[PDB]
Design an enzyme around this catalytic site. Structure first.
Site, mmCIF file in Angstrom:
data_model
loop_
_atom_site.group_PDB
_atom_site.id
_atom_site.type_symbol
_atom_site.label_atom_id
_atom_site.label_comp_id
_atom_site.label_asym_id
_atom_site.label_seq_id
_atom_site.Cartn_x
_atom_site.Cartn_y
_atom_site.Cartn_z
ATOM 1 C CG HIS A 80 -2.155 -0.929 0.910
ATOM 2 N ND1 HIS A 80 -2.312 -2.122 1.581
ATOM 3 C CD2 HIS A 80 -3.171 -0.859 0.017
ATOM 4 C CE1 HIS A 80 -3.387 -2.742 1.123
ATOM 5 N NE2 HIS A 80 -3.926 -1.996 0.174
ATOM 6 C CG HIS A 84 -1.863 0.105 -4.398
ATOM 7 N ND1 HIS A 84 -2.598 -0.750 -5.196
ATOM 8 C CD2 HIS A 84 -2.747 0.687 -3.553
ATOM 9 C CE1 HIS A 84 -3.869 -0.694 -4.839
ATOM 10 N NE2 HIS A 84 -3.982 0.163 -3.840
ATOM 11 C CG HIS A 120 -7.261 4.350 -3.885
ATOM 12 N ND1 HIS A 120 -6.349 4.253 -4.918
ATOM 13 C CD2 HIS A 120 -7.240 3.155 -3.244
ATOM 14 C CE1 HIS A 120 -5.804 3.049 -4.903
ATOM 15 N NE2 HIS A 120 -6.333 2.363 -3.903
ATOM 16 C CG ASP A 121 -5.076 2.580 -0.676
ATOM 17 O OD1 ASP A 121 -6.071 2.626 0.063
ATOM 18 O OD2 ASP A 121 -4.823 1.606 -1.407
ATOM 19 C CG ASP A 224 -8.378 -0.573 -4.689
ATOM 20 O OD1 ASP A 224 -7.139 -0.537 -4.529
ATOM 21 O OD2 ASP A 224 -9.185 -0.477 -3.743
ATOM 22 C CD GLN A 256 -3.223 -14.253 -4.251
ATOM 23 O OE1 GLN A 256 -3.748 -13.775 -3.253
ATOM 24 N NE2 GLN A 256 -2.850 -13.515 -5.273
HETATM 25 C C1 LIG Z 1 -0.974 -12.801 -1.938
HETATM 26 C C2 LIG Z 1 -1.150 -12.913 -0.420
HETATM 27 C C3 LIG Z 1 -2.574 -13.163 -0.085
HETATM 28 O O1 LIG Z 1 -3.399 -12.295 -0.803
HETATM 29 C C4 LIG Z 1 -4.728 -12.152 -0.511
HETATM 30 C C5 LIG Z 1 -5.299 -12.935 0.496
HETATM 31 C C6 LIG Z 1 -6.651 -12.807 0.805
HETATM 32 C C7 LIG Z 1 -7.436 -11.904 0.112
HETATM 33 S S1 LIG Z 1 -9.182 -11.732 0.526
HETATM 34 O O2 LIG Z 1 -9.634 -12.974 1.214
HETATM 35 O O3 LIG Z 1 -10.016 -11.489 -0.689
HETATM 36 N N1 LIG Z 1 -9.290 -10.434 1.534
HETATM 37 C C8 LIG Z 1 -8.713 -10.482 2.837
HETATM 38 C C9 LIG Z 1 -9.371 -9.535 3.786
HETATM 39 N N2 LIG Z 1 -9.546 -8.212 3.252
HETATM 40 C C10 LIG Z 1 -10.070 -7.217 4.186
HETATM 41 C C11 LIG Z 1 -10.072 -8.206 1.925
HETATM 42 C C12 LIG Z 1 -9.327 -9.110 1.001
HETATM 43 C C13 LIG Z 1 -6.864 -11.124 -0.890
HETATM 44 C C14 LIG Z 1 -5.508 -11.230 -1.185
HETATM 45 C C15 LIG Z 1 -4.997 -10.404 -2.266
HETATM 46 N N3 LIG Z 1 -5.426 -9.115 -2.431
HETATM 47 C C16 LIG Z 1 -4.959 -8.357 -3.506
HETATM 48 C C17 LIG Z 1 -4.024 -8.959 -4.439
HETATM 49 C C18 LIG Z 1 -3.600 -10.299 -4.230
HETATM 50 O O4 LIG Z 1 -2.714 -10.871 -5.110
HETATM 51 N N4 LIG Z 1 -4.103 -10.991 -3.162
HETATM 52 C C19 LIG Z 1 -3.656 -7.964 -5.499
HETATM 53 C C20 LIG Z 1 -4.722 -6.934 -5.390
HETATM 54 C C21 LIG Z 1 -5.194 -6.957 -3.974
HETATM 55 MG MG LIG Z 2 -7.473 1.005 0.405
HETATM 56 ZN ZN LIG Z 3 -5.947 0.357 -2.844
#
Ligand SMILES: CCCOc1ccc(S(=O)(=O)N2CCN(C)CC2)cc1-c1nc2c(c(=O)[nH]1)CCC2
Ligand SMILES: [Mg+2]
Ligand SMILES: [Zn+2]
Length: 297
Positions: A80, A84, A120-121, A224, A256
């Site tokens: 973040h 990004h 936004h961040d 995003d 993922q």
């Molecule tokens: C790669 C390490 C693990 O990554 C993730 C694990 C869990 C999730 S999630 O279950 O959809 N979630 C976790 C809790 N958040 C508040 C919202 C997102 C997203 C991600 C995740 N988010 C993002 C990316 C990603 O590759 N994985 C790129 C864009 C944003």
């Molecule tokens: Mg954000």
């Molecule tokens: Zn963001």
């Protein structure tokens, strides 16, 4: 100062064309770019969306604004951070150009999306870091990002909206605010049903102000999250950054896949329905699911 020096280099530079910078591509990547270079790409985004002209932005002011924005992301945060925000803006730009969304929106909307994507961040400290209440969710984090955005828009020398009339200014801030608040996944979950349901019935319509606003919100989430749509080698790399932030590995691939199924696929499908030319986002997202799914065993 190191910083007025940075301002001078940036204001003096010739900004290459969008084509040269590859910023029209959905598969764009920033890994090999310097800070200065990301700043130039950003100017080219404002310029080729015709925003510098329509709203009479002075060059020195836009340059200073971009540097302020950049400065108010923390580099010690693995995901973040400014890159990004820069990528979210690039994807917005590509959806407007290559994805052909531009023609569906007003200049003021486009202006506000670009600024929102970049801001936004602002000042994010990492998902693992977190007055009164705060009782019921309410996007406290996003309110902070938007406040940060506002303070920069009002800093001396940084006023890129000075060319707008008071009425345009107010409309633009409202859009910027909604746009930034829309990057809260909870809000996205809350509202997506309406949007999907509407596309289901081929009733979706941009002329309806309520629907326009809903579309802008969906658009923000799509940008995003767009790292999830990148070419495999790049997506692996970004996943690395996210993992570093989330935890400061055998379970990562399934995570993922979960994220892609729960959140990403439908959104990119919906965006494709609205504009067929946004298909590369959906396609890239599907290919990545296949890859992570294979690792998942
Ligand atoms: C790669 C390490 C693990 O990554 C993730 C694990 C869990 C999730 S999630 O279950 O959809 N979630 C976790 C809790 N958040 C508040 C919202 C997102 C997203 C991600 C995740 N988010 C993002 C990316 C990603 O590759 N994985 C790129 C864009 C944003
Ligand atoms: Mg954000
Ligand atoms: Zn963001």
């Amino acid at each position: 100062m190191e910083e007025t020096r940075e301002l001078q280099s940036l204001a003096a530079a010739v900004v290459p064309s969008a084509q040269t910078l590859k910023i029209t591509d959905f598969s764009f990547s920033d890994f090999e770019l310097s800070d200065l270079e990301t700043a130039l790409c950003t100017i080219r985004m404002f310029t080729d969306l015709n925003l510098v002209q329509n709203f009479q932005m002075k060059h020195e002011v836009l340059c200073r604004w971009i540097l302020s924005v950049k400065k108010n992301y923390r580099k010690n945060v693995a995901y973040h951070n400014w890159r990004h925000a820069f990528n979210t803006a690039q994807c917005m730009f590509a959806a407007l150009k290559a994805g052909k969304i531009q023609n569906k929106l007003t200049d003021l909307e486009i202006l506000a999306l670009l600024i929102a994507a970049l801001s936004h961040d602002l000042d994010h400290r990492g998902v693992n870091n977190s007055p009164l209440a705060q009782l019921y969710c309410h996007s406290i984090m996003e309110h902070h990002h938007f406040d940060q955005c506002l303070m920069i828009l009002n800093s001396p020398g940084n006023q890129i909206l000075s060319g707008l009339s008071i009425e345009e200014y107010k409309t633009t801030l409202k859009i910027i605010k909604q746009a930034i608040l829309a990057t809260d996944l909870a809000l996205y979950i809350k509202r997506r049903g309406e949007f999907f349901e509407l596309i289901r019935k081929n009733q979706f319509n941009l002329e309806d102000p309520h629907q326009k606003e809903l579309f802008l919100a969906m658009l923000m989430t799509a940008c995003d999250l767009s790292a999830i749509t990148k070419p495999w080698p790049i997506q692996q790399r970004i996943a690395e950054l996210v993992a570093t932030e989330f935890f400061d590995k055998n379970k990562i691939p399934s995570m993922q896949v979960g994220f892609i199924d729960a959140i990403c696929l439908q959104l990119y499908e919906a965006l494709t329905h609205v504009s067929e030319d946004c298909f590369p986002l959906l396609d890239g997202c599907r290919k990545n699911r296949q890859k992570w799914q294979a690792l998942a065993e």
